[PDB]
Amino acid sequence: LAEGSTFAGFTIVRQLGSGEVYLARHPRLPRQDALKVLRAEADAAASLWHPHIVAVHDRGEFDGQLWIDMDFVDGTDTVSLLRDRYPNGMPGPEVTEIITAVAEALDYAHERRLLHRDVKPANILIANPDSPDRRIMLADFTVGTVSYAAPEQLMGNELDGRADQYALAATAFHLLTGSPPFQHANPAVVISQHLSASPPAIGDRVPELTPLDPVFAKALAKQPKDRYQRCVDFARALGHRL
Amino acid sequence: LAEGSTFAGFTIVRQLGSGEVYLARHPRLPRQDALKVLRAARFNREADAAASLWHPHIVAVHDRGEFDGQLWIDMDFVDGTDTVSLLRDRYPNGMPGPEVTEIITAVAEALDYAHERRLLHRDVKPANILIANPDSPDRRIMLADFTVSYAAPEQLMGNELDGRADQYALAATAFHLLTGSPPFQHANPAVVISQHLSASPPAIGDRVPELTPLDPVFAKALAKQPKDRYQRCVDFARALGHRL
Numbered sequence: 162l163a164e165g166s167t168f169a170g171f172t173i174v175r176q177l178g179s180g181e182v183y184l185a186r187h188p189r190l191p192r193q194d195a196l197k198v199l200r201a202e203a204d205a206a207a208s209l210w211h212p213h214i215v216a217v218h219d220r221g222e223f224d225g226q227l228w229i230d231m232d233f234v235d236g237t238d239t240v241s242l243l244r245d246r247y248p249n250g251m252p253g254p255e256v257t258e259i260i261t262a263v264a265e266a267l268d269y270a271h272e273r274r275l276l277h278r279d280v281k282p283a284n285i286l287i288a289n290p291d292s293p294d295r296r297i298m299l300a301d302f303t304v305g306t307v308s309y310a311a312p313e314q315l316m317g318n319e320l321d322g323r324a325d326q327y328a329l330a331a332t333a334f335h336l337l338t339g340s341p342p343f344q345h346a347n348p349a350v351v352i353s354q355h356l357s358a359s360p361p362a363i364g365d366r367v368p369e370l371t372p373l374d375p376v377f378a379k380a381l382a383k384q385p386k387d388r389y390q391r392c393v394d395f396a397r398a399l400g401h402r403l
Numbered sequence: 404l405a406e407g408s409t410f411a412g413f414t415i416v417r418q419l420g421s422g423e424v425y426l427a428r429h430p431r432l433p434r435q436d437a438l439k440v441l442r443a444a445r446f447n448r449e450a451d452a453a454a455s456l457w458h459p460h461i462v463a464v465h466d467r468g469e470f471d472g473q474l475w476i477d478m479d480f481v482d483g484t485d486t487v488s489l490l491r492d493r494y495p496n497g498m499p500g501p502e503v504t505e506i507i508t509a510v511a512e513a514l515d516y517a518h519e520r521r522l523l524h525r526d527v528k529p530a531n532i533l534i535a536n537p538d539s540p541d542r543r544i545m546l547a548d549f550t551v552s553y554a555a556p557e558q559l560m561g562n563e564l565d566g567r568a569d570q571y572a573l574a575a576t577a578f579h580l581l582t583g584s585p586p587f588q589h590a591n592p593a594v595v596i597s598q599h600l601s602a603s604p605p606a607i608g609d610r611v612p613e614l615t616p617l618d619p620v621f622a623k624a625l626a627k628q629p630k631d632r633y634q635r636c637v638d639f640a641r642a643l644g645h646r647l
């Protein structure tokens with residue numbers, strides 16, 4: 162609900178997402194930033210300094226609305242790259258590149274006792290995808306995207322890094338095929354499959370990818386104890402077969 | 404200046420370097436930033452190039468402003484060491500070859516990236532080369548701040564600059580990192596300046612015999628005429644690597 166508008170000195174350029182997120186020209190510096198705005202306290206994002214995690218510049222309050230100024234990743238999210246190219250799935254080597262980059266960001270955040278809690282294709286941005294300056298970034302540190310949420314997180318149990326691993330594996334499944342491991346119009350059904358349904362064989366969707374079956378079986382395990390120890394271990398197990 | 408003082412909401416913690424640069428607690432976010440402050444040209448200080456640059460080896464600028472007539476730049480604080488402190492306290496006679504190729508390659512990339520976008524650093528030196536978590540897997544080489552020891556002759560003369568000026572500085576920096584001292588060392592800055600302008604670039608082999616093979620590399624990168632240097636900073640970084 163703002164275009165060509167001025168907000169805390171920022172000039173609104175485009176809507177980027179929804180907590181509504183605008184592409185905005187900075188009041189003092191000649192560059193474009195991502196401005197997240199509230200209508201009616203994630204300091205952790207400022208705590209993180211990683212080449213694959215979107216940086217926060219500043220936070221504030223303008224006319225009762227809380228705002229976060231952060232880096233703008235000038236490219237696409239993996240959702241759009243999936244729908245406009247690769248509707249049936251991304252090439253294996255490009256997925257290992259993206260998942261490794263995000264695995265590192267998450268492992269870094271985990272070592273500092275911070276969980277992302279919402280890893281999904283829409284939070285994986287790639288600046289200049291077809292350029293040498295190509296850069297993979299992780300952003301955004303009731304029925305939301307239950308498509309990638311780990312069962313223990315849905316149940317509201319005590320979390321660790323292996324919750325984000327599940328989400329990353331669910332994300333990777335989506336990127337390689339053209340759909341998440343559990344697809345249904347009814348969120349309640351998706352939630353129930355996360356909790357109770359055996360994780361599906363990726364080979365049953367894309368025959369060429371059968372070798373990865375035990376990899377997704379492991380990373381999408383119901384019990385966190387049965388997954389990989391770190392996200393890069395999962396990313397490496399992908400690489401080994403792609 | 405005063406440690407524990409408030410400047411534009413930032414709490415000053417210590418001076419990091421010198422444009423004096425302080426480690427400062429951010430007014431609103433719970434983290435430490437590098438705050439660069441000016442005393443008394445304003446247009447020049449508004450080289451808004453640094454905000455234009457977004458590279459994994461270039462220190463990020465968050466914001467710029469004016470507090471009681473003093474211009475300030477809020478930028479990332481690289482929690483680790485500069486290469487100066489690494490030389491003084493760990494490797495007084497020079498750093499290991501492989502570690503220097505790592506650092507110079509990382510900085511060469513940052514500079515080559517900035518050059519392709521028509522932007523020059525203009526002050527490459529050991530104190531602007533930071534390494535966060537040096538001894539950790541999270542190790543990260545950063546070039547910050549986008550003394551005549553490293554300045555190229557054309558830059559000292561105030562002539563038209565190109566990327567090859569920063570190359571000279573990077574090569575002079577690499578010489579220092581490898582040997583313990585810059586290519587031209589003298590208490591009198593005027594003498595250092597004169598050697599930059601007129602003196603044949605020294606043989607790195609004449610300081611550290613093991614490094615004789617790099618002689619033509621530094622001869623080339625420290626050339627008087629920019630046209631006689633490498634085309635890109637990574638070409639210089641690669642020529643180092645080949646012989647280390």
Ligand SMILES: O=C(c1ccc(Nc2nccc(-c3cc4ccccc4s3)n2)cc1)N1CCC(N2CCCC2)CC1
Nearest residue numbers: 176177178179182195232233234236237238241300301
């Ligand atoms: O591919 C992208 C895209 C490009 C760059 C960024 N960058 C960028 N940088 C930094 C941070 C963020 C974000 C952070 C954040 C947090 C919560 C929700 C969304 C977001 S987006 N994004 C984000 C997307 N788009 C096409 C589809 C999209 N949609 C929604 C409107 C019409 C269709 C609009 C934009």
Ligand SMILES: O=C(c1ccc(Nc2nccc(-c3cc4ccccc4s3)n2)cc1)N1CCC(N2CCCC2)CC1
Nearest residue numbers: 419420421424437479480481483484485488530547548
């Ligand atoms: O090893 C360091 C060091 C650590 C972190 C940073 N970080 C950091 N981050 C972000 C930006 C910057 C800089 C910006 C900038 C701009 C101009 C000149 C130098 C710099 S350094 N630095 C810079 C140094 N120090 C050792 C002692 C040194 N003493 C002795 C001699 C003088 C004072 C200063 C501190």
